[PDB]
Symmetry: C11
Subunit: 184 residues, 11 copies
């Protein structure tokens, strides 16, 4: 089952070589840090799809080992919420990587929305930081300074328009059900 | 049993390819956020059916690892309830994904109804966010900005009328019972 | 034993296809919500029989993982009781689904009756919401808005009179005892 | 041992078909609810015998997972006692069903008798509600409204006189001891 | 060992048929309830011998899962003691039944004697109520109203005088020791 | 080892038949209850020897599952000590019986002696009550009223003088050591 | 290993027959009870040697399951210490017996010596009372009243002088070391 | 799986020889310590890539065994946060190394950002210090004084510009998916 | 390994016969008890060597199951320290013996030295009392009164001078290393 | 895996002989103790490399079993921090050694830096003291007084300049990757 | 692995005979006890090397089962620290010995240094006292009074000068690495 299967040599080399390279300009987005320069990051769904495409959708898993609210402060009617989360990512071979993410809320008035934002963000950057440890292709290169400098010297590409003419419009999946029938 | 069976190659490719694409305009609904623009989301039962159709009704499971009431506040006779829930979704191969959902209640007067809404919603978006990690087909594409922009440029389709002439009107299931007899 | 047997292909397809469709007008009942429109729901015993008929009487199980009284308030001599319950439903293959139900009591004067109602209702809607996740046939369709709209356009069928001429009037079960003898 | 043996096909169909039907007029008794109409129920020993006859005396078990006194109140010299009990019923195949029962005492003066009544009744309706989930024959039909309406249109049968000429008057069991000798 | 051996078909039918019938007039005794009619019950040793004779002396076991003193009150120099006990009875096949018994003391002056009576009685009716669930022969019929009415219409038999000419007067057991020698 | 060996048919019948009968006049002794009639009981060592002779010295075991001091009260310089003990007796086949005994001290001045008496007596009647459940021969018949009435109509036998000419006067056991040598 | 080996038939009969008889006048010693008659007992080392000679030095074990100081009181400069100890004795076949011993100190001035005496005595009579349960030869007969009466009618034998000409004067054990060499 | 596979001789010698040497001038960076000289260190991603390249991306894992906030102090409106983290690095053969890292924040005003920095840095230097123990190539040489002195005598190389013409611009990985297909 | 090997017959008889006899005058030393006569005891190292010589250096083990300081009192500048220790001695066959030792300090001024003495002595007499249970040769005979009386009638032997010409003066052990080489 | 492999005879003798000798003048460094003479010690990385070279990089592991801050004192604006750490070093054969190290900080003003220094130093000398127990080659000889005296009589060798022309300048490891490919 | 291998006969006799003798004058050192005579002891590293040479470097292990600070007192500016440590030494056959050591500090001013000394010394004499139990060669003879008296009558040998011409001056171990290669 999970955490027991042994990677084959061809699969090992494929995944290692694929993880060796860096990301392209489409993945990295930017934010305006408070009292700082432009901070480059990667969207959560981009890294998620990268994971399901590199290790397989059934090849990697992530769990929240422990999450606790660090603080909820009420200052002049605003809620400052800080939350930490421990996220562990495990492959199908048994390897794993555990890292901490932080969720921060400072502007919202409603306490419930503040905790919602804080906990969801804590989990999402926990996942990001835990997947970063597996190689450059999953998001390590964002921390490299020379890589960011080279990125700054690239043309600003326009966002791609999604061609959805072949999207999912009917529920029944004849191919998937047929394959599962052949597997049963 | 569950969490032990190994996915076959044909089934693996079928589910991976099916999870690769995005959702169609029928799945995404909209809400009017308080002091915000239109927020797009997916209904819970849509994602549930997507799960039972992609992995099989017996292929995926979800459990509530931990749920705790964050706060219940009484302000001038109204109840503000905020609840967090940890939901873990596991496939039949052993892979899993754990995520946090939040339930919020702010308008209801009765405390019992407020907690009912908060806990049920916390579990439902916990399930949604935990299933989002498995691919674009299960709801990841809702977070993509370009995908939403493309969706905004689509015609507004009328809701489909359900043809229920072949609904379930008798309890006895001759086909299911016969198949189970042949299996016993 | 339970949670270990593997579903056969024929049984898998039978149960999947049976779970794919929706329910008929006989199952859904209605309630008059306080300060609201007609709220449609499904009776507990209907869903129970649906479970024993779809998965077999020995094919599904449910347990109360955790139940705790959220609040018991005494307001001007009335008891407001709110209770939450965690219910886990497991099939014979190992798959499972866990969900939360709420029990509410607001009118009864006696505390004991209020807790009785609250806990029993909490468990019953916990079972309902946990069985809802297995497909449309077990009660998912109640949440679909288009399905409810189509239901509203149906004739109001009169309740069926139960023909009990073949009810259980003697204790001794010659068929069951004979079959168990042949099995021993 | 218990919870490990697999049901045979013939036994499975026998028990399923036997559980499919409903109960006869002899089983259901009535009570006069406080400020209400006639409430129909089933006696505990009737359901107990139904269990030992349907699944075998060694085929089903029940345990009290957790019982706690909800409240003991002293009002003007009377004791109001409310108790909850969690009862789990398990078959010899491993299937199980867990449900909550409530015991209520409001008239008795002595505290000890009040707790005796409350706890015993809590366990007995816990057993009833946990056995109800296995099918219509074990007591599910009591909750069906149309079934009760049909029952109201039946003649009121006189209670049966027990013919005890073949009761147990001697301790020694030659048949049972001989069978156990042949089994040893 | 215990809880692992499988009952044979002949033994199963013997014990089931023996448990099917009811008890004779010798077993049931009567008590004068405080402010009530005659309450019929069964002596503890009668049920104990019934157990060792029906399932074998090595075929059934009972344990006290949990016992706690509910209350010890001192009223004007008298001790009111109420105790609850959870008793679990298990057969050699693994089946089990768990039930609650209550011990009550209200007249004794000495606290130690009151607790002695309360705890011993709690355990004894715990055993009685736990053995009641196995069938009519072990004491279920005491709760049947028609059975009690039929019992009231029976002649009052005089208590039997025990013929003890073949009692145990010497310690050494040549038969038992010889059989154990042949078994070793 | 202990709790695993299976009783043979001949041994089973020997022990069952031996346990079926009642005790002789030598075993039962009498005490003068405070403000009561003559209370009949059995000495601890008598029951102990009965156990080692019926099941073998290596065939039965007893353990103290839990013992707690119920109360130690100081009244006008006297110590009233009440102690409860849970004793579990297990055979070599795995069967067991658990029961509660009480130790009482009310006259002694020294606290240490009072607790000594209370705890030792609690354990000894715990053992007695736990062994009572195995049959009439081990002490069940003491609770039978007709048996006691028949005992009252018996001649009062003089206590037997022990013939100790063949007592144990030398430590070395040539027979036991030789048998153990042959077993090694 | 320990608690797993099965006793052979010859060894079983040897140990049973040896345990059947009673002790000789040399073993029982006497004490002058405070405000009482002569109390007969057995020395600890006598019972210890009896154990190592009956079951073998490697055939029996004893452990202190739980020991707690009941009370340490300071009265006018004297220390009254009462201690209880739970001692479990286990044979090599798996059988066991657990019993409570009490240690008492009332005259000593130093607290440390009082606890030393109390705990050591508690353990020693715990061992005595736990070994008493295995038969008459290990010390059960001390509780028999007729046995003590017969003992009182015996001549008072002078204590035996130990002939130590063959005592242990050199450390090296050629026989034991040679046997262990042959065993290795 | 992980922690079970045995390293081969050729792989063992390869990794040992590779770990024997020291790092080149590109890896070590410098910081200006407060009131101190230039402090040399290694970037986190450099060591991460070194780990995935030396032991394989699936050959090493790291987990956070325990992390606790040492202190959060508020001094004149600034937050001094000190956090410790225990990080354990394990190879695929079972070997492991556990070490402590510290995260420090002293300048930031917002508490949430201070804890974010402190915890993330604590984990990152925990990983660094835990990987340092495996050899000189993974970062041990930074602590050698003579190595640092030799480094100071080296020319200051300009940072390398990353050639990203072959970066990751499309999601689909034909090579990885094909290899996984061949492995399934 | 330890606690699993079975003693051979020759080894069993050798150790049993060796343990049967008593100790010689060299082992027993004397102390002047406070306000008492001469108290005879055995030195710790003597008993230790006796253990390693009787059961082998690898044949017996001892562990401190639990040690707790009973009291540390400060009286007029002196420290009275009383400590208890539970010591368990286990043979290589699985047999064991557990006993309590006490450490006492009353004269020392420094607290640290007092606890040092108390704990070390508690452990040493715990070991002595736990080894006493294995037979007369390991120190049981010290408690025999007739043995001590016979010892008093013996000539007072002068202490033996140790001939150390063949002591250990070089570290390297050619014999031990050669034997271990032959064993590897 | 780790802690299971058995050392071979040749490897055992190699490691034993290598551990037998002492260290050379290059390893030992000196410190100026406060109010003391020159204190000789060994650098952490030296001992680390000695470990990876003697037992192999995959042959030894170390873990922090428990670390707790002993004290953090604020004296006139300075922070005195004392920390203890328990470090366990285990070989691949299962052998282990556990020892305590202490971290001390007394001069630093910032609390965070003080704890950083204290905990890191505590772990590093815990590792040193735990590795010292394996032989003279890993650092035992530092405690020998005659060895230190002989060291003082040696010429003061100049520190060696590291020849880094063959350092690690490229990430890709063709040899390691090729060996791992051949191992997969 | 460790604690499982069985000692061979030749190895057993070698180690037993080697442990039988006593130590030579080089091992024992002396200290000037406060207000006492010369106290003889053994250095820690001497006993450590004795252990690795007698049982092998991989043949014995030691662990700190539990260590707790007994007291830290501040008297007029000096720190009196007393610490106890439980040390367990285990051989490769499974045998073990557990003993307590004490660390004392009374002169140092700094608290951190006092705890450092106390804990390190506690562990070191815990190791010494735990290794003492294995025989005379590992340090038992230090407690023998006649052995010490004989030692006092020996000439005072000058400390040996260490010949370090063959010390460890290069890291690479060709012999050890070659042997490990042959073992892999």
């Amino acid at each position: 089952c999970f955490g027991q299967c042994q990677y084959t040599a061809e699969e090992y080399q494929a995944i290692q070589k694929a993880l060796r390279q860096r990301l392209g300009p489409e993945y990295i987005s930017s934010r305006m840090a408070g009292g700082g320069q432009k901070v480059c990051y990667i969207e959560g769904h981009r890294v998620i799809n990268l994971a399901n495409e590199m290790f397989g959708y059934n090849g990697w898993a992530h769990s929240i080992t422990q999450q606790n609210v660090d603080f909820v402060d009420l200052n002049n009617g605003k809620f400052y919420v800080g939350v930490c989360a421990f996220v562990r990512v495990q492959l199908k071979d048994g390897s794993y990587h555990e890292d901490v993410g932080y969720g921060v809320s400072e502007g919202l008035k409603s306490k419930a929305l503040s905790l919602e934002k804080a906990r969801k963000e804590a989990v999402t950057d926990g996942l990001k930081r835990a997947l970063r440890s597996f190689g450059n292709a999953l998001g390590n290169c964002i921390l490299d300074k020379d890589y960011l400098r080279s990125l700054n010297k690239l043309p600003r590409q326009l966002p791609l328009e999604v061609d959805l003419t072949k999207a999912k419009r009917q529920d029944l999946e004849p191919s998937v059900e047929e394959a599962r029938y052949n597997s049963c």
